[PDB]
Paper text:
The outer membrane is a formidable barrier that protects Gram-negative bacteria against environmental threats. Its integrity requires the correct folding and insertion of outer membrane proteins (OMPs) by the membrane-embedded β-barrel assembly machinery (BAM). BamA is composed of a 16-stranded β-barrel, which, in E. coli, is preceded N-terminally by five polypeptide transport associated (POTRA) domains that extend into the periplasm. Unfolded OMPs are delivered to BAM by the periplasmic chaperone SurA, but how SurA and BAM work together to ensure successful OMP delivery and folding remains unclear. The results suggest that SurA binds BAM at its soluble POTRA-1 domain, which may trigger conformational changes in both BAM and SurA that enable transfer of the unfolded OMP to the BAM lateral gate for insertion into the outer membrane.
To determine whether the SurA-OmpX hybrid is compatible with substrate engagement at BamA-β1, and thus competent to begin folding, we engineered a new Cys into β1 of BamA and a second Cys into the β-signal in the C-terminal β-strand of OmpX (BamA-S425C and OmpX-R170C). This complex of BAM and SurA-OmpX is therefore only tethered via a disulphide bond between OmpX and BamA at the site of OMP insertion to the membrane. In one, BAM is in a Lateral Wide-open conformation, in which the BamA lateral gate forms a continuous β-sheet with residues in the C-terminal region of OmpX. Three β-strands of OmpX were resolved, corresponding to β-strands 8, 7 and 6. Remarkably, density for OmpX was again observed in the Core domain of SurA in the same location as that seen in the Arrival complex, indicating that this structure has captured BAM in the act of folding an OMP whilst SurA is still involved in binding and chaperoning its client OMP and remains bound to BamA POTRA-1. We term this the ‘Handover Complex’, reflecting a handover of the substrate from SurA to BAM for folding into the OM. Importantly, in this structure SurA is stably bound to POTRA-1 of BAM in the absence of trapping via a disulphide bond at that location. Collectively these results show that an OMP can be simultaneously bound to BamA and SurA, and suggests that Extended SurA could remain bound to BAM at least during the early stages of OMP folding and insertion into the OM. It appears to be the OMP, rather than SurA, that drives the BamA lateral gate towards a Lateral Wide-open conformation, as observed in the Handover complex.
Author numbering:
A (entry chain E): 25 to 113
B (entry chain B): 24 to 98, 105 to 392
C (entry chain F): 25 to 164, 393 to 428, 431 to 441, 443 to 447, 449 to 455, 595 to 603
D (entry chain C): 30 to 109, 115 to 212
E (entry chain D): 26 to 243
F (entry chain A): 24 to 495, 504 to 690, 699 to 808
Write the structure that this text describes.
């Protein structure tokens, strides 16, 4: 509206250049080097890494992009899920 | 303001006037040495003397009358900063400068025979011998200039601790070898035909730590007689050592001198505390001392009629009897002060004041 | 029973050493030579020697130079050869003379380490121009006079360095050269947030 | 009392007890990396205002080389006619001697009163003084039999410690007065 | 300032001044006695009395300096637990320095470093000498300090919840869950983590904390 | 033989068994052989002794021990150029302090250090002597004798070796002085060692930024006369030759921001080589990279130089590195203000990529609040993961307000009671609260105001106020107002609100202005005699706009602040008017360290009526006093009240009530304009320990105010009040200090240009902002 709202950033921003080099079959060190340390990790049971990239210019659309990596209990990568988000709101 | 607490004890000289020496003339060369420490001093050659100032002008004088002969200015843009003591030889007069320029003038004609650029300020008096004039610049560099026209021959390199005293030492010539001082307490000898060393002997005895204030650089011209040479570091250790090699014939701790003379089987010098003193060249035995003058900022002692002539910053010229010391006379020659070394030759002496310029003194 | 004669920086020299080098080394079959000054006169120089040996010891310890036991045994062999007195019977000589095995080992370790420190420290600052060798040869050639020249430079520079170090070393003499043994020697009210009480003119001025 | 008192209030005694949250079925909570761990300890200790903050008394200085020694209820002291001196200082303080064996060098005094600028606590004491030699020297022992507060016997260790140390200090200062 | 005197009577009058409670005067005599005889027979008593006087006189920094000095140069002493407990008490008192105590303001989300230091001192005391008489009060103070730190973390998480920074909220709640598991502030703050997951469209992770809070709703 | 036991003598720093743990003799056990000498050596190796003397008078070790003394006090005489604080700090850093053991080695250590320091300062004829005086109980008192002789004077700076610039021009820029001007006393000719390195780098920079690249300093010599009075400095330079930029190449692991980097490196062909230019290029590249996240880049430049064509190629190698994310933000020092009041002024959200500009922007915003003395930021890397960082803000709290409660006057003259609280930070909650009530026989006043700057978490502020005036002629007035404000952008704020007031005054003095206002309002009573009353009520809407950009909040040293406030009546009230006021304070720094500042202050004000009704006289503008042209009076500048001839009127006592005659009394017009310029200098009597709290200024002030209602008839023979061309002027000196009781301002101002009825004063004291 009229009241000023500062820009809000809530996670590491990931670019398609570094996304395209991720293929199922690497270990923790390789993906950590390629993309960066994940801010959000599942603290319950299984080890899951969440790369969330969300912006908010203030009274516009809240752009979001989530990338969930599911690792097995051995240190190697198993599952990838890249969601451009924007599921409605 | 509150830090002017100097430990300064220079008693006024005891009033003991016996004889009556006087002056001959003054010349007023102009604003000369002034407060700036330097080595400018008049030189006498065949009834003609010469003088100069920090500004750059050089004057020639006839003896016995003090009449001008020819005056030139070696300025153009700014002072030439004349530093090298005026020396004369043959048909040339040589002068140094702080701008790394050495001037050689053609005496009677008063024309610039040449000038050349050296490495660093040329404080030391240019010494002439064997068709070469030697400059001991303020970098440890010792440069030989060809007598014909400039044309540096060899540049010997010497060390330079970074707190040295000003007034680097001019070398002396003996049997084809130049004996020179140094800024680190080491007396060197050099073969003055290609620039090769013979022996480099250290004579200083410095401590450490607080020694950052102790400098012990030899800025005195070494004197040579027979097979021995003599040297004096700033902080002590008078040395008499062999000409052939750096073999110390005999040393003494006292040292601490900036000017000395040797003659008549004895050595007459002044300590860094202005304590004029006499020694025996045989082994370094003290004949006598004269401790009336302390912290008075004396000058070089010169022989004249068997008397040691000295000066001070207050201007009073003192005569010392060569026999155990006694104030023969005190002359209120000038109020400017005496800082440069007096010259004595041909039975006649000259002293250039800091600003009063050359003064001719009679006995 | 023992005392300390002087203290130097960190270490200390005690009466044991001065007694050992004075009672056991003075004309008492310690090179004899039938020449020895007064005990009081030589006491000063022997104390100087002991304290300077100590000073050299800490100076070396600053660099921490270590010498191993094989060098000590080779030094013992050198002593045996230079005494024309073989190592086992030389050891017996030392044992009954007063210096037993451990004292001799420590003494040789100390003398070797101080000699090594002296040599390195002096030779690091020595200079010889390749010019005067020919001059001395002509006065007298192919390194014959070079050894003598280096020896003279060593003699001057070592003494100068000794004076320089002795002058500037912290020593306190508690009291209470050297010929040595000659042989067997190798090489309004207010309160305090803020509160002001003054003096109708009574007004509180407390500041949070 | 104003002194002998914790400066803060008592509001820290109403903290909610810590209850470990339980894990759900078939899922593990984040590990207890919480170095902020509280070891479990019994009670029987004064809390809040009931606790006293008082510099633990130590037997003071006397004749040189006299090593003091702590005990839970007693106090000891090495020294360098020591028993006659001790008897002398006790008489100087006018403490009545109920029992005395000079041969055994052991004595028992009367009730001694200790009041220290606080009301209802004019401490009274039953003390059994004794001396016996130890090694090359002699050792003085002050043994506190009983302690009373306003006529009420009490048994807290700190009070017995302090009021044995005070009596030991009385001897020690009296011993220096010789 | 006090006239030179042999130590016994000056110590006696310092003790009397402490007895009366005139701490400001007593510090002078105690400090003079400590200065004039640095290594006397009973300098330890002087140090302990000085610590007590400094703490009572609300002169905390000097008390802390003396406590650290005594710990350093007397590592072993029969009553070092008293000094440790007093150091912890000094830190905890230093935490509360404001007029807000008059109004009962919730001094929980202010600067907590003093609370952390007090927790460290009390935990060191409890782990060190669990047979002393200061242990129960130390345990109560430790519980209070842990709750206070948990409350501060919950306050930060609540502010970020209000702002709209969901990832910071998740990180803070995870930190509380990892470091303050058994406190009450973590139970209060778990719904904030659930709301963050719900707002950030990660439901599969949201129902997990929903189950955690539902099973432990009580 | 066998020793039975041990005995010692000294027990100060070493206990009975403390020494036993170290000595290898291990008595009470096996022991024998000269090894006792080794025991002595082991005991002394500890360093806790000064002398040891073993003795075997019996069969027990009689070890005489003389322990090293513990220093009793430190004292010193003769120190003039060196302050006691530096000496005691060095001693604390030298391992010597009261109560600590004394070791003789540290005596020589500190002697050497002090002598070297004096030799660096220039006092070459200086010597420090350390005297130790023994005292009973093995302790010492340390005396230091300083024989500070005389400072050496520098004589000349010689730049021998130059052939392209004047030597005087080269040495003009130097911090060291060759010849101090005669008309300059603040400067002198002392030789400080660091200044030599500084001006060597200055000369090097001078040649590097004028196309000279093949440049170096051959040598530097510091000669000293054999008097310790003359210091000569000589430097040898290699002039080299000028050069031209062949071109610039930027290569390396540049991030996706290559385009703007290339634009930044665009250099005009034919320019001269400047080292400052390339340093600025590197700093700009680093800042541009740090804005986008890469906080730790690596930028280097090798100027590959070809002398054949005198062309230099700038080869810039840039390695971006890894982007850094903030793990958490912590706050230290806020013992009173809570965490939210700090965290809400941030612009760097937690759990986001580090914007190195946002951290400093948040630091500035926190510094602008006005209740934090010093704010320090620190972006420190985590000890664990590579690309993580913790941002720490350290703030030092500042006292904000005061609580006052004082009864004054009295003594048969009247009780003068007053009380109040004035806080900008109420208990750290962030609220702004203010209550003030004064009670005296002559008049009674009360007011209250509460403002929340963050009613919602966007910047919205809500505030309200109540006020009450009633006293004697009689005057009563009370009212209420409520406003709210919101931010337009980073800097601007916009406010709107409404409120109502009620006034009632009676038995008013007769004077032209108030009668004019009444006739405008529609009441025309008698003029010579006054026994009338009047009542009014006003409902008004007010608005405002503030632009703020300041370095700090309490006497800032940068930026500017403009503040506009305008109130207009709503239809339905008794009066109809509109007022517009403007304020503008601007600061410009001239010194690099922001120590010398030029201040420009201005204030403007207009006010008038609506629909033919005059502006009420109880809200006119005023001037004088403090906060305006200072040195005249409180609210006296401008139009002066002129009274109609007096009559029966009110009760007129004899010897009292001595009131169209002209009077010096003032009433205030409805158009005001004042301005002022100030120069700020540091206090020349203190140091930096207090320099952040005291401000000294020289000021010039001008001010004027006039009445927009003019009569050709009534004002026929009276001064032209409606004429603005006449102004009042003043000048003087002002001193401000953040006293522990709030901000206090002192001023002395000689009245420069004043008019009739001003009663201008000289000394002026005030409390407030």
């Amino acid at each position: 509206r009229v009241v000023y709202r500062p820009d809000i950033n809530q996670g590491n921003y990931l670019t398609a250049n570094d996304v395209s080099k991720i293929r199922v079959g690497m270990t923790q060190q390789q993906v950590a080097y390629a993309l960066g340390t994940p801010l959000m990790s599942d603290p319950f049971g299984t080890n899951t890494w969440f790369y969330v990239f969300r912006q908010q210019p203030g009274h516009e659309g809240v752009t979001q992009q989530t990338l969930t990596l599911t690792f097995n209990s051995s240190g190697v990568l198993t599952n990838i899920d890249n969601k451009p988000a924007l599921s409605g709101n | 303001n509150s830090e002017e607490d100097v430990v300064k004890m220079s008693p006024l000289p005891t009033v003991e006037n016996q004889f009556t020496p006087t002056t001959a003339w003054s010349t007023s060369v102009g604003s000369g040495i002034g407060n700036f420490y330097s080595n400018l001093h008049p030189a006498l050659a065949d009834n003609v003397v010469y003088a100069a100032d920090r500004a750059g002008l050089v004057k020639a004088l006839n003896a016995d009358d003090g009449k001008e002969i020819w005056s030139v200015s070696l300025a153009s843009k700014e002072p030439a900063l004349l530093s090298g003591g005026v020396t004369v030889s043959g048909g040339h007069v040589y002068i140094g400068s702080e701008k790394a320029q050495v001037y050689a003038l053609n005496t009677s004609d008063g024309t610039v025979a040449w000038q050349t650029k050296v490495a660093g300020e040329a404080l030391s008096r240019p010494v002439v011998s064997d068709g070469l004039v030697l400059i001991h610049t303020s970098n440890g560099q010792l440069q030989a200039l060809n007598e014909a026209d400039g044309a540096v021959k060899w540049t010997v390199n010497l060390d330079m601790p970074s707190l040295s005293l000003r007034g680097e030492s001019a070398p002396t010539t003996a049997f084809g070898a130049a004996v020179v001082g140094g800024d680190n307490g080491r007396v060197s000898a050099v073969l003055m035909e290609q620039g090769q060393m013979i022996w480099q002997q250290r004579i200083s005895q410095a401590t450490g730590s607080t020694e950052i204030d102790r400098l012990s650089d030899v800025d005195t011209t070494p004197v040579v007689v027979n097979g021995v040479v003599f040297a004096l570091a700033y902080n002590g250790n008078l040395t008499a050592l062999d000409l052939r090699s750096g073999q110390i014939m005999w040393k003494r701790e006292l040292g601490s001198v900036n000017d000395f003379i040797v003659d008549g089987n004895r050595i007459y010098l002044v300590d860094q505390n202005d304590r004029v003193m006499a020694l025996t060249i045989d082994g370094g035995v003290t004949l006598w001392t004269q401790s009336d003058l302390l912290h008075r900022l004396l000058t070089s002692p010169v022989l004249y009629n068997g008397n040691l002539v000295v000066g001070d910053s207050e201007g009073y010229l003192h005569w010392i009897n060569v026999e155990d010391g006694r104030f023969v006379a005190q002359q209120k020659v000038d109020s400017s002060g005496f800082q440069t070394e007096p010259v004595a030759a041909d039975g006649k002496l000259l002293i250039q004041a800091k600003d009063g310029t050359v003064y001719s003194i009679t006995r | 029973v023992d005392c300390v004669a002087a203290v130097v920086n960190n270490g200390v020299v005690l009466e044991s050493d001065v007694d050992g080098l004075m009672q056991s080394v003075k004309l008492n079959a310690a090179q004899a030579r039938q020449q020895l000054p007064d005990d009081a006169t030589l006491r000063h120089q022997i104390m100087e020697r002991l304290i300077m040996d100590q000073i050299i010891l800490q100076m070396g310890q600053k660099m921490g130079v270590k010498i191993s036991d094989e060098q000590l045994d080779q030094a013992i062999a050198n002593i045996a050869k230079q005494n024309n007195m073989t190592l086992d019977q030389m050891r017996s000589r030392l044992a009954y003379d007063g210096l037993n095995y451990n004292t001799y080992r420590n003494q040789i370790r100390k003398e070797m380490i101080i000699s090594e420190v002296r040599n390195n420290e002096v030779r690091r600052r020595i200079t010889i121009l390749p010019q005067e060798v020919e001059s001395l040869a002509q006065q007298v050639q192919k390194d014959r006079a070079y050894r003598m020249l280096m020896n003279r430079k060593f003699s001057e520079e070592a003494a100068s360095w000794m004076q320089e170090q002795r002058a500037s070393a912290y020593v306190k003499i508690l009291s209470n050269x050297x010929x040595x043994x000659x042989x067997x020697x190798x090489x309004x009210x207010x309160x305090x947030x803020x509160x002001x009480x003054x003096x109708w003119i009574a007004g509180v001025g407390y500041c949070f | 009392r104003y002194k002998r008192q914790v400066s803060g209030d008592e509001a820290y005694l109403e903290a909610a007890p810590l209850a470990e949250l339980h894990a759900p079925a078939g899922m593990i909570l984040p590990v207890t990396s919480g170095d902020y761990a509280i070891p479990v300890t019994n009670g029987s200790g004064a809390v809040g205002k009931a606790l006293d903050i008082r510099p633990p008394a130590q037997p003071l200085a006397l004749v040189s080389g006299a090593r003091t020694q702590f005990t839970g209820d007693t106090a000891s002291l090495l020294v360098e006619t020591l028993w006659p001196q001790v008897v002398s200082v006790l008489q100087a303080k006018n403490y009545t001697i109920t029992q005395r064996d000079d041969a055994g060098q052991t004595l028992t005094t009367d009730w001694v009163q200790w009041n220290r600028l606080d009301e209802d606590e004019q401490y009274r004491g039953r003390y059994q003084i004794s001396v016996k030699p130890q090694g090359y020297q002699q050792a003085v022992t002050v043994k506190l039999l009983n302690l009373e507060q306003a006529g009420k016997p009490v048994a807290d260790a700190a009070s017995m410690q302090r009021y044995s140390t005070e009596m030991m200090n009385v001897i020690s200062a009296g011993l220096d007065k010789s | 300032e006090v006239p030179d005197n042999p130590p016994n009577e000056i110590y006696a009058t310092a003790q009397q001044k402490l007895q009366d409670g005139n701490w400001r005067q007593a510090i002078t005599q105690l400090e003079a006695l400590d200065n004039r005889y640095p290594f006397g027979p009973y300098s330890q008593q002087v140090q302990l009395d000085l610590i007590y006087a400094y703490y009572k006189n609300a002169d905390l920094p000097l008390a802390q300096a003396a406590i650290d000095r005594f710990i350093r140069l007397n590592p072993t002493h029969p009553n070092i637990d008293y000094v440790m407990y007093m150091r912890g008490l000094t830190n905890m008192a230093l935490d509360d320095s404001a007029l807000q105590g008059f109004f009962g303001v919730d001094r929980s989300d202010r600067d907590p470093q003093h609370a952390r230091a007090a927790f460290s001192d009390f935990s060191k005391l409890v782990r060190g000498y669990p047979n002393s008489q200061y242990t129960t009060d130390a345990t109560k103070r430790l519980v209070f300090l842990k709750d206070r730190l948990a409350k501060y973390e919950y306050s930060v998480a609540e502010y970020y919840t209000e702002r709209g920074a969901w990832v910071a909220v998740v990180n803070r709640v995870e930190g509380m869950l990892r470091d303050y598991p058994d406190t009450q502030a973590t139970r209060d703050a778990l719904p904030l983590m659930e709301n963050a997951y719900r707002q950030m469209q990660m439901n599969a992770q949201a129902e997990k904390v929903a189950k955690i809070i539902a099973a432990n709703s009580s | 033989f066998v020793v039975k036991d041990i005995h010692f003598e000294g027990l100060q720093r070493v206990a009975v068994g403390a020494a036993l743990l170290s000595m290898p003799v291990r008595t009470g056990d096996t022991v024998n052989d000269e090894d006792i000498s080794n025991t002595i050596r082991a005991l002394f190796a500890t360093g806790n002794f000064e002398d040891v003397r073993v003795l075997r008078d019996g069969d027990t070790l009689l070890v005489q021990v003389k322990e090293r003394p513990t220093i009793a006090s430190i004292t010193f005489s003769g120190n003039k150029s060196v302050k006691d604080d530096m000496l005691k700090q060095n001693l604390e850093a030298s391992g010597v302090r009261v109560g600590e053991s004394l070791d003789r080695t540290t005596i020589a250590d500190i002697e050497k250090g002090l002598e070297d320091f004096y030799y660096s300062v220039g006092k070459y004829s200086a010597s420090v002597k350390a005297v130790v005086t023994p005292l009973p109980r093995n302790r010492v008192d340390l005396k230091l004798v300083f024989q500070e002789g005389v400072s050496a004077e520098i004589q000349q700076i010689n730049i021998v070796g130059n052939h392209a610039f004047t030597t005087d021009e080269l040495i003009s820029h130097f911090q060291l002085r060759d010849e101090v001007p005669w008309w300059n006393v603040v400067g002198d000719r002392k030789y400080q060692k660091q200044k030599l390195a500084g001006d060597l780098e200055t000369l090097r920079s001078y040649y590097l930024d004028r196309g000279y690249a093949r440049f170096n300093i051959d040598s530097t010599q510091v000669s000293l006369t054999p008097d310790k009075k003359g210091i000569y400095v000589t430097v040898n330079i290699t002039e080299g030759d000028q050069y031209k930029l062949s071109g610039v190449e930027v290569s390396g692991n540049l991030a996706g921001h290559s385009a703007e980097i290339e634009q930044l490196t665009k250099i005009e062909p034919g320019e001269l080589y400047n080292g400052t230019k390339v340093t600025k290029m590197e700093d700009d590249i680093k800042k541009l990279l740090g804005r986008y996240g890469y906080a730790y880049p690596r930028v280097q430049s090798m100027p590959e130089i070809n002398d054949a064509d005198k062309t230099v190629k700038l080869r810039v190698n840039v390695d971006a590195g890894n982007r850094f994310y903030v793990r958490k933000i912590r706050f230290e020092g806020n013992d009173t203000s809570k965490d939210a009041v700090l965290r809400r002024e941030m612009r760097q959200m937690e759990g986001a990529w580090l914007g190195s500009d946002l951290v400093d922007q948040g630091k500035e915003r926190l510094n602008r609040l006005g209740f934090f003395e010093t704010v320090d930021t620190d972006t420190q890397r985590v000890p664990g993961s590579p690309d993580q960082v913790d941002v720490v803000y350290k703030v030092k709290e500042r006292n904000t307000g005061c609580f006052n409660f004082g009864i004054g006057y009295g003594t048969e003259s009247g009780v003068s009671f007053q009380a109040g609280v004035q806080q900008d930070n109420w208990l750290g909650t962030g609220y702004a609260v203010g209550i003030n009530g004064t009670k005296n026989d002559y008049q009674t006043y009360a007011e209250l105001s509460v403002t929340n700057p963050y009613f919602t978490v966007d910047g919205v502020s809500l505030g309200g106020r109540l006020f009450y005036n009633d006293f004697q002629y009689t005057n009563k007035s009370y009212g209420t107002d409520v406003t709210l404000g919101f931010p337009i952008n980073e800097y601007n704020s916009l406010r709107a609100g409404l409120g109502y007031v009620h006034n009632s005054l009676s038995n008013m003095q007769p004077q032209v202005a108030m009668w004019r206002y009444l006739y405008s309002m529609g009441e025309h009573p008698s003029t010579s005699d006054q026994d009338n009353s009047f009542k009014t009520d006003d409902f008004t809407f007010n608005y405002g706009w503030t632009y703020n950009k300041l370095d700090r909040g309490y006497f800032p040293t940068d930026g500017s602040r403009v503040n506009l406030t305008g109130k207009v009546t709503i239809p339905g009230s008794d009066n109809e008017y509109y007022k517009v006021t403007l304020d503008t304070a601007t600061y410009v720094p001239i010194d690099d360290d922001h120590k010398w500042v030029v201040l420009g202050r201005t204030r403007w004000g207009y006010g008038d009526g609506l629909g033919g009704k005059e502006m009420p006289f109880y809200e006119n503008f005023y001037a004088g006093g403090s906060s305006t042209v200072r040195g005249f009076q409180s609210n006296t500048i401008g139009p002066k009240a002129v009274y109609f001839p007096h009559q029966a009127s009110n009760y007129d006592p004899d010897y009292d009530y001595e009131c169209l005659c002209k009077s010096d009394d003032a009433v205030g017009g409805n158009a005001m304009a004042v301005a002022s310029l100030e120069f700020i200098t540091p206090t020349p009597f203190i140091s930096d320990k207090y320099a952040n709290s005291v401000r000294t200024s020289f000021f010039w002030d001008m001010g004027t105010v006039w009445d927009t209602n003019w009569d050709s008839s009534q004002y026929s023979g009276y001064p032209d009040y409606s004429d603005p061309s006449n102004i009042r002027m003043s000048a003087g000196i002002a001193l401000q200090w953040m006293s522990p009781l709030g901000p206090l301002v002192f001023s002395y101002a000689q009245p420069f240009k004043k008019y009739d009825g001003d009663k201008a004063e000289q000394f002026q004291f005030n409390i407030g902002k």
